[PDB]
Each structure stands twice: as structure tokens, then as C-alpha cells.
């Protein structure tokens with residue numbers, strides 16, 4: 001089956017990517033499909049905070065190491081995250097109330113992960129899901145204890161740890177241009193970058209319902225108006241996996257000069273976090289679905 | 302769907318189990334099927350040596366902790382392994398040439414894992430795949446460096462770490478009573494048990510091709526002739542998933558008084574290590590397959 005990564009590279013983009021991990025690569029047909037058809041891998045779970053630092057200073061890198069090794073042996077790009085995120089956050093972190101302690105705990109978590117893989121990771125999602133739906137900053141432990149400068153500190157710490165990685169902020173429900181969360185993140189990123197914060201990218205965690213593809217054609221250009229060097233579409237899946245929805249998201253990428261690529265959130269439907277909505281590009285028999293073929297067609301023209 | 306675990310408990314057995322791990326329980330329909338239909342879980346990868354001790358004395362428990370917690374919350378039995386195995390073995394272990402050092406490394410690995418989950422684990426696979434196909438002992442780093450006492454030492458150490466747990470040796474290609482490996486593990490286990498080695502169980506890692514189920518009716522009673530308190534069928538899958546092959550394996554279990562239960566190597570076909578042979582009991586849409594219903598009927602007759 002024709003490679004969507006090759007085709008999107010031929011249209012001037014960097015990658016078509018997919019989330020995976022060790023036990024995906026040793027089961028099913030996932031390794032063969034990724035080798036043939038995708039240009040970048042992301043860790044489905046193995047770089048999250050509760051997988052990598054379940055207790056203070058007790059780092060667990062076996063899973064992440066496997067993925068990074070596999071990607072290098074097979075000539076794929078590699079992304080990483082979530083470095084700073086309130087979900088799947090171990091209790092030992094959320095129980096901290098001292099500002100200096102939490103600051104150093106955050107800095108050490110960022111520095112340790114990025115150092116280990118220094119120079120091998122194209123992009124890191126440094127901070128994720130930092131905004132409320134009304135556009136105010138989400139009141140996580142980091143905001144409550146450190147304050148609003150936790151985002152500047154995180155990005156400056158990450159830039160120091162690996163200056164070769166592109167540093168992203170990411171969030172979800174950025175899929176419509178009239179939604180308050182979309183314009184808020186644009187405005188805050190503008191202001192942070194004007195003050196010298198090294199935010200290289202905005203990543204849009206794109207979990208869509210049927211029919212919401214079309215809206216990304218006007219949301220993604222808006223996200224790009226923040227002036228970051230890059231934007232990306234991340235963790236993509238679409239309930240029903242209609243070709244129309246998937247083609248609209250791909251075309252939004254193509255229409256936006258700074259959008260470097262697209263990452264789908266898994267290979268085959270039965271391995272999706274919402275498998276009953278069959279929202280991915282390959283079915284339970286690892287056959288390409290009509291949406292995969294529609295994307296190929298769209299990219300060929 | 303009717304629960305094969307409830308039905309096999311009704312026939313006087315302990316469990317019908319499945320291998321799983323954290324990212325299976327958060328994707329597909331695996332958690333719901335396990336909750337409804339299976340009585341025991343085993344770690345697909347999270348307790349192997351490369352996952353738990355990737356550098357000497359530095360242990361990684363995030364993935365294993367998740368599985369143990371989930372099982373306790375949902376009222377399921379838990380198994381564990383492999384403690385001593387030549388595959389998925391970090392290179393820091395396989396490069397040790399000193400007998401004392403390797404003995405202590407092996408004992409520390411066993412003792413640390415078993416102590417952490419002391420009293421919570423029904424059975425541990427202490428030693429796996431220790432035999433060659435001709436019935437001689439496999440020349441692994443443990444055999445080359447420590448000698449054949451490594452198996453006695455492993456079991457003695459395991460018994461002291463958690464006396465509640467059932468201790469197993471396991472291997473594959475024990476599916477034919479006339480195959481030399483089958484008689485060889487019987488010979489050795491009888492000798493070890495006569496020397497007081499605490500081997501509670503032989504686990505048969507049952508990876509079958511079409512038509513091989515019938516032979517297990519003779520092989521499993523032969524394995525039981527070693528006199529261990531228990532035997533089990535583990536990591537079960539069958540190319541083609543013929544009802545006749547699966548029912549023959551279940552009936553071998555039922556016929557052998559010391560056989561405590563059966564564990565299948567995953568829930569749904571696309572998540573198998575040999576998915577193209579569709580060898581499991583649920584298909585790529587998470588529907589029970591003919592073999593599942595045939596097992597249900599067999600357990601009710």
C-alpha cells in the first residue's frame with residue numbers, strides 16, 4: 001500500500017506520523033505498516049510522567065529506550081512528551097506545595113528526559129493541556145504553586161537541555177476558529193514569544209467527531225497566526241473515519257505553510273482508545289480503510 | 302458472552318486467564334472482556350527482566366504496579382514472570398562471567414520482584430525455556446556461568462521470598478508425548494523435586510498449529526507424571542483457532558486432576574504476536590469467535 005509519509009514529503013511536508021510503543025511493534029502488523037507508510041513515531045504511553053518517574057527520582061526508561069532504538073534502526077523521526085501535564089500525574093508531584101521544590105522537580109524531570117535522548121528527538125511536547133475551555137490557564141498544581149511563569153520556566157529549561165529539539169505547547173479542542181480556547185492560546189503564545197520564550201510550535205491534539213474535519217481548515221490557519229515557526233496536527237483520530245473528515249484535516253495541513261505534519265493516534269481500530277468508533281486508518285484485519293485510500297488520492301494530485 | 306472462567310471454576314478448576322498490560326486495559330474492549338470473562342491476568346511484558354531491571358539493582362515497577370492494582374480492584378488473580386529467562390535479558394547480565402556475582406544478581410532480581418508483590422501473586426514462572434529441543438539444558442548465561450545448580454538456587458530463593466506463591470518452571474514444545482523435550486522436563490523435575498527443590502508446577506507454553514490440539518490429551522498427563530502439585534497451560538494460542546483444537550486443549554485440562562487452569566496469550570487476534578494466523582478467541586471487532594462458543598458448550602456438557 002502506497003506510503004502517505006512519502007506522498008506528504010513530496011508535497012513539501014516533514015512527516016506523516018503515528019503513535020506506537022514496544023508491545024505494538026512486537027504484535028499485529030504494526031511494525032511492517034510503520035516501516036512502509038509512516039515517517040515518524042511518538043510514544044503512546046512510554047514517555048508520560050507516570051510511566052517515566054512514578055516515584056521521585058526513580059526513572060523508568062526501558063519502554064522509551066525501546067522505541068527510540070527501534071526508530072533509529074528503521075530511519076524514522078522521533079517525538080516525545082508529555083513533559084509537563086496534569087493528567088496521569090503521580091500523586092507525589094501533585095502533593096508538593098513548596099514553590100522552589102516543585103520548580104526543581106519540574107526542571108529535573110524535563111532535563112533528565114531530554115538529556116537522555118539529546119539530539120535524537122525532533123520535537124518535544126513540553127507543556128500540554130494548559131488551558132481551560134474558556135481560555136484561562138488551567139489551575140493545575142504547576143500553576144497553583146509556581147504561578148504563570150511555570151510555562152516560561154519549562155520552555156527555557158527545555159531549550160537549555162536540548163537546543164536541537166523543536167519545543168511545542170499542545171492542547172485539544174483547538175479545532176474551530178470561533179472557539180474561545182483557540183484564540184486564547186494564539187494570544188498567549190504571541191505574548192510569550194514576544195518576551196523571548198522559546199516556543200517553536202503549537203500542536204493541535206485533534207480528536208474529532210464525524211463532520212468536524214471541515215472546521216480544521218479555518219482553525220489551523222488561526223493557530224499559525226501566532227507566529228511560531230511550526231504547527232502540527234497531533235493524536236489525530238476521527239469517529240467513523242469518514243474520508244471527508246480525514247481529507248479535510250490533511251488539506252488543512254497542506255494549506256498552512258508552517259504546518260510540518262500530521263500524526264495519527266495509532267495504526268488499527270481495535271488498538272484505539274475509542275475502538276468502538278473505528279476512528280483510525282486501518283481496520284481490525286490491518287487492511288487500509290477508504291479514508292487511507294482517500295488521503296493517498298488527495299496527496300497525489 | 303458467558304464467562305469461560307466461571308464455567309471452568311464450575312468444573313473444579315482455578316481459572317481461565319489471559320495475558321495483558323496497561324496499554325491493553327486502556328484501549329480496545331480488553332478491560333471489559335477481562336472483567337466479564339477471565340479470572341486471572343498475567344503480564345504480557347511488564348515483569349520481564351528488560352522491563353524491570355534494565356541496569357544493575359535499579360528496578361522499574363511502573364507497568365507491573367499498574368497491572369497488580371487493576372487486578373486487585375477488579376477481583377482477579379495475578380501471575381508473574383519470567384524471573385529467569387535468556388530472552389529479553391539486558392546485556393549487563395549476559396556479560397557477567399563470575400559465578401558468585403551472577404548468582405547474587407539472579408537472587409537479587411528474584412527476591413526484589415517477589416517481595417514487592419509478596420502475598421498478592423498466585424503463581425510465578427521462576428524459570429522459563431531452560432531446555433533444548435533434544436532435552437539437554439539450554440546453554441544460557443546462567444547455565445554457562447553458574448552451572449546446572451542455577452535452577453535449584455532460583456527456586457530455593459523464590460520460596461524464601463514469598464512462601465505463599467506457587468513456583469513454576471515453564472517451556473514450549475511440550476505438546477507431544479513422544480517429543481524428547483516432554484519426557485526430558487519430566488525426568489529433570491522428578492530429580493529436582495526428590496532433592497527437595499520447591500517446584501510446585503510445570504507450565505506448558507502452548508503455541509499450536511492446526512490439528513495439534515489432540516496431542517495435548519496425551520502430553521499433559523505425561524507432564525503431570527512428574528508429580529508436581531500443579532500443571533498449567535499458558536500463553537495458549539492456535540493457528541486458525543479451530544474449535545476442535547481449542548476444545549481438545551480444554552479437555553486435556555479437565556482430564557488432568559493437577560491442571561489448575563488455562564491462560565490464553567491475549568484477547569483479540571490483531572493483538573497477537575502472530576496475528577496473521579488469527580489464533581485467539583476474539584476477532585478484530587472484539588466479537589467471540591466460534592472457538593470461544595465451542596469452549597462454552599464443552600464446559601457445560
Ligand SMILES: O=[N+]([O-])c1ccc2nn[nH]c2c1
Nearest residue numbers: 019042081082125234235263
Ligand atoms: O501525536 N501523537 O500521537 C502523540 C502521542 C503521544 C504524545 N506524547 N507527547 N506528545 C505526543 C503526541
Ligand SMILES: O=[N+]([O-])c1ccc2nn[nH]c2c1
Nearest residue numbers: 320343382383426535536564
Ligand atoms: O500465560 N501467559 O500468557 C503468560 C504471559 C507472560 C508471562 N510471563 N511469565 N509467565 C507468563 C505467562
